């Protein structure tokens, strides 16, 4: 019995794109907030600085017209958010899952386990049930539904898949991460400027993987080896990110020091994960860093001394997709292996042997997955 | 990193102190929900409560707390924010008290805990209940957490199935498993257009249960109570839509079709075969049981289809009787009851003197969680 491997990665996004250059005009119009000149000026500066070029959203002017509470800050809107989210999350998840299954090239009857992560709505039965039904998976698949673990849940999903894959001979785990801003969209309000930071970054996306130990070569094709998977609570961080699931939807609150609480601690997380394999040069590694806005990626870069090369996959997904929550770190893994093939590098990890996937979110929580690349040549 | 199977090393339970006897619950319920005029619903509710075989339930919710949170007691009113204010702190707090009972039986420092699995459908926030009990128990900040939110009445099974893989794949791993439920998420006043509310109100109750799960016990402090042999999960065929729950502004709005009981009853034998065929076991009455007590009718129906005697189901029916339907926690209380009653009538194993047993989680999907268990001799389990 060996290490859990990534055998396939797939991604999906809803079709409707709003460019960041268009987004402030769009946002202030569909929330009937054009009278709030200062917030609109504040929001244009945040978006000009975001280094997100474009985002996909299921939410459109049409949907918001049909569900006006979603576009009114603090209005009872959760019922109508859930009516969207209950079906759109499994639906988008299925599309991401189909791309992974196609790459994998094996029948779906070989899938033994399903790990689904989202914070974009919830019901019983959950998105894990729904995607099982939509893909016609075996009814006896062993399911782990991961609700409401926010922007670190990509890490959590992989860490769970790792133990499922490694402890069960022949197990193939379908991992799906999906987010939909129907859960997080808020109109602007002078008292809750955290909303403007959210509306500059949050976006729709689904990513899927197939995880298995002991790949059947060469008809199965590993992309990454999962070596280790850690979770930690940052010291002195209690209350830094808090989200409530309220009648108005997901109401979230960020302290001033979120970026420096991650930044002053990330080096300790890298030592905890890499010391035992004798690694201390952080630029010797390839990276999937959760792109929770520009400031989080820049702070982690500054504190680890990461060069432009090691963050270009992370920054490409932030630019082209925005903060799709749990899905982002999986999009980055996809981008990383594609770019590696395109630039004729020796490994799926940008020519590097060892790598790091970092999930960041409430607690504050750091998810650290240690990866090895696979040869391309 | 294996060396052996995940064992239950400890079990502890906690309940809120306010108890309402079922004989008193219809008068309580119709009074606090301002529903005295709804006479036909009150008579229906009395008949359901009598048939329930729930004698007693624990609740955080009191008359006083409903007076301070009257939205909760007003059918369909926006109450979720008031429900989350209660549940955000009470679920981790109740989970903590259960965990402290399990950790005392375990007799190891909490620094030995490497993983935390927390199951609840009773409120949700970020960071979740996993984070909160980690903080309340002063666990090592680098514990590996699996937060199982909103899986409903099969989550007890899910929690052990996750714990099994965490404990068997990580050498030295000790998994704290906590299942907690609080009816602040599910409490609704009666309504002529939502009859399924009367079914839940007869059943749903508060409780927390905790386990320490680990492979390779270490004497003298650690003793196994149960061995986990296998953990299975399945969708009951032709079951789509039988149990639906939405998380709405009014709280958890749930819909329980009539045919839930036949769908579970008519497929449970296939679940037992799938789980026990490889061990050459077919005599369902020779096994010990923790069956999710999702109301009297589901237990009775599984009893009839498997041929289980009164002896097999007394632990299950004891918990339904004395605690009601505490959601995820029930199957863990029943394992606790089973080993306690075994020790008390001087049986030879923690499973009522039987060698093999099964824990059955039942919930939306419809989903069946099946945990294949082995008992431990009382000699090696007790002190």
UniProtKB/Swiss-Prot annotation, chain A:
What domain of life does the UniProt record list for this protein's source?
Eukaryota
Q: What is its EC number?
A: 2.3.1.220
Q: Which UniProt keywords apply?
A: Acyltransferase, Transferase
The reaction(s) this protein catalyses: benzoyl-CoA + 3 malonyl-CoA + 2 H(+) = 2,4,6-trihydroxybenzophenone + 3 CO2 + 4 CoA
Q: In which tissues is it expressed?
A: Expressed in young fruit pericarp.
Temperature effect, per record, is: Optimum temperature is 30 degrees Celsius.
Per UniProt, what does mutating residue 325 to S do? No effect with benzoyl-CoA as substrate, but loss of activity with p-coumaroyl-CoA as substrate
The active site consists of: 151
InterPro entries from the UniProt entry:
Chalcone/stilbene_synt_C (IPR012328), Chalcone/stilbene_synt_N (IPR001099), Polyketide_synthase_type-III (IPR011141), Thiolase-like (IPR016039)
Q: What is the effect of changing residue 119 to L?
A: Changed substrate specificity
**Which cysteines in this chain are paired by disulphide bridges?**
none
Q: Which GO terms describe its biological process?
A: benzoyl-CoA metabolic process; malonyl-CoA metabolic process; polyketide biosynthetic process
User: Where are the bilayer-spanning segments?
Assistant: none
Q: Which GO terms describe its molecular function?
A: acyltransferase activity; tetrahydroxybenzophenone synthase activity; trihydroxybenzophenone synthase activity
| pH-dependence annotation | Optimum pH is 6.5-7.0.
What the entry lists under PANTHER family is as follows: CHALCONE SYNTHASE, HYDROXYMETHYLGLUTARYL-COA SYNTHASE
Describe, as the record does, how this protein assembles with itself and its partners.
Homodimer.
Give the family from UniProt.
Belongs to the thiolase-like superfamily. Chalcone/stilbene synthases family.
Protein role:
Type III polyketide synthase involved in the biosynthesis of benzophenones and xanthones. Produces mainly 2,4,6-trihydroxybenzophenone together with minor amounts of tetraketide lactone, triketide lactone and diketide lactone. The preferred substrate is benzoyl-CoA, but can also use acetyl-CoA, phenylacetyl-CoA, hexanoyl-CoA, cinnamoyl-CoA, p-coumaroyl-CoA and salicoyl-CoA.
What is the protein's name according to its record? 2,4,6-trihydroxybenzophenone synthase
Naturally occurring in which organism (per UniProt): Garcinia mangostana (Mangosteen)
